[PDB]
């Protein structure tokens, strides 16, 4: 018997896999994407109906808390000599 790792069986599997199985997978993905878009649109419509009744640079620090914490942490690592990359 040929093992699961047999080269000829895996080659035949790949030849089969590039065809009808992949076609079915692609069709299922398209249908699922359509249903997802419809679900989002229905949620938007319901939210609009509910509200009817009621009616970039990434440089620098993330925020001041992040700046303070990271500076304190790097100073602590420098003081305690527990840094991975800096002496």
């Amino acid at each position: 018997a040929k093992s699961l790792r047999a080269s000829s069986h895996l080659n035949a599997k790949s030849v089969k896999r590039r065809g009808v199985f992949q076609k079915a997978v692609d069709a299922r993905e398209q249908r699922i994407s359509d249903k997802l878009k419809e679900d989002l649109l229905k949620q938007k419509l319901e939210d609009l109906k509910k509200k009817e009744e009621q009616g970039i640079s990434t440089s620098g620090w993330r925020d001041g808390r992040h700046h303070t914490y990271k500076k304190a942490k790097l100073m602590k690592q420098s003081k305690k000599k527990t840094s991975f990359t800096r002496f």
């Binding site: 599997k13 089969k16 199985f21 299922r28 993905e29 249903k35 997802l36 419809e38 679900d39 990434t58």
Partner: protein, 386 residues
């Protein structure tokens, strides 16, 4: 000297150590490979195992002995109300592996997901994300910068979603929060999808569909401390053997002067993380369908819920997934349903399921009736009815 008779070893060495899992929710170790041409989609979903029942299938399988015949098969029911998208996480590639760069949360988070961050919800002031919500004011600076950072640097995009456990019959009020990988277009498109879907729900039929092979990831049912005989399947010793018969007679008879790691020992059984694959979805039932338990062959108007409800779980009032066979975990445990990591080349993945009948008899006994109306019609008029 050599063992006289050959025999395979007892148990699998690749499922070691047999310790309790670190969490009640099993981790997803691998997501399907991302194809940048495809539309954006979730790679997984979260649900609660409700129980099992029985179906009859009109089988179409050419070349099989049961071609054009009926087969009775066991199925598992997973209650799957829609998940709520509440966050996004970006991951960058480093020589040490994947690293989370940033996480962006939605403006409003429900108390159901806020309870996950508390050990004592009733005594707490419920201050979670209160200062975070203020960052959406005056044009959303900070939020926009972190989203741009994810767009610029991240190579993997995941979305933080949580279950709506208040729609289940469970006594637990604390929701489950998890990361689900987004497989689809570009990184910018994934970030835009997450931002547009913040605070929005995703249903199960917008992730999976019928006749699809999926994977179940969950923690198995625990059993406490167990002996070697039932932990590893070893043969029992003869009757009235000294010092017990539910043991391995000789744990070592050779030079190393140690107990080998591959020798069966008593310890914890169950409550292990398992990832089982290739479970076929037999039905994606909707919660608003009055006859989601009916078929084209069985015209009885009934739901999926059995008589008296599922034992130890309750009724099914949301969308559900019916897969054939069994999945790891017991009833009311949280399970993760994952997309297949490869394009399956077996014809079972291409087979189309047509159910003829779904069993809804009581699982609390030897149930003989599918509906209370059927039970009343069979029994007739009782003393209290007159």
């Amino acid at each position: 000297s050599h063992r006289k008779y050959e025999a395979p070893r007892h148990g699998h060495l690749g499922f070691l150590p047999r310790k309790r899992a670190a969490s009640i929710r099993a981790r997803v170790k691998a997501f399907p490979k991302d194809d940048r041409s495809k539309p954006v989609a979730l790679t997984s979903f979260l649900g609660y195992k409700a129980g099992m029942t029985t179906i009859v299938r009109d089988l179409d399988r050419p070349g099989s002995k049961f071609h054009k015949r009926e087969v009775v098969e066991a199925v598992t029911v997973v209650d799957t109300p829609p998940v709520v998208v509440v966050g996004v996480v970006g991951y960058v590639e480093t020589p040490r592996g994947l690293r989370s760069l940033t996480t962006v949360w939605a403006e409003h988070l429900s108390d159901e997901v806020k309870r996950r961050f508390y050990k004592n919800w009733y005594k707490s002031k419920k201050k979670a994300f209160t200062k975070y919500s203020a960052k959406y004011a005056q044009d959303g600076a900070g939020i926009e910068r972190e989203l741009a950072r994810i767009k610029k640097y991240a190579s993997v995009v995941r979305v933080l979603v949580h279950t709506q456990i208040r729609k289940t019959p469970l006594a637990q009020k604390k929701a489950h929060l998890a990361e689900i990988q987004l497989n689809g277009g570009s990184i910018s498109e994934k970030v835009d999808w997450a931002r547009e879907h913040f605070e929005k729900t995703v249903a199960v039929d917008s992730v999976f569909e019928q006749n699809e092979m999926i994977d179940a990831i969950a923690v198995t049912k625990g059993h406490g401390f167990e002996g070697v005989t039932h932990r590893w399947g070893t043969k029992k010793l003869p009757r009235k053997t000294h010092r017990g018969l539910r043991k391995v007679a000789c744990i070592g008879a050779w030079h190393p002067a140690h107990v080998m790691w591959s020798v069966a020992r008593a310890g914890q059984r169950g409550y292990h993380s398992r990832t089982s694959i290739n479970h076929k979805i037999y039905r994606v039932g909707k919660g608003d369908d009055e006859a989601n338990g009916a078929t084209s062959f069985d015209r009885t108007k009934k739901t999926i819920t059995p008589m008296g409800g599922f034992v130890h779980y309750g009724e099914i009032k949301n969308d559900f997934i019916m897969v054939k066979g069994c999945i790891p975990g017991n009833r009311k445990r949280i399970v993760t349903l994952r997309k297949s990591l490869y394009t399956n080349t077996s014809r079972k993945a291409l087979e189309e399921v047509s159910l003829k009948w779904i069993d809804t008899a009581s699982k609390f006994g030897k149930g003989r009736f599918q509906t209370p109306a059927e039970k009343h019609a069979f029994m007739g008029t009782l003393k209290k009815d007159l």
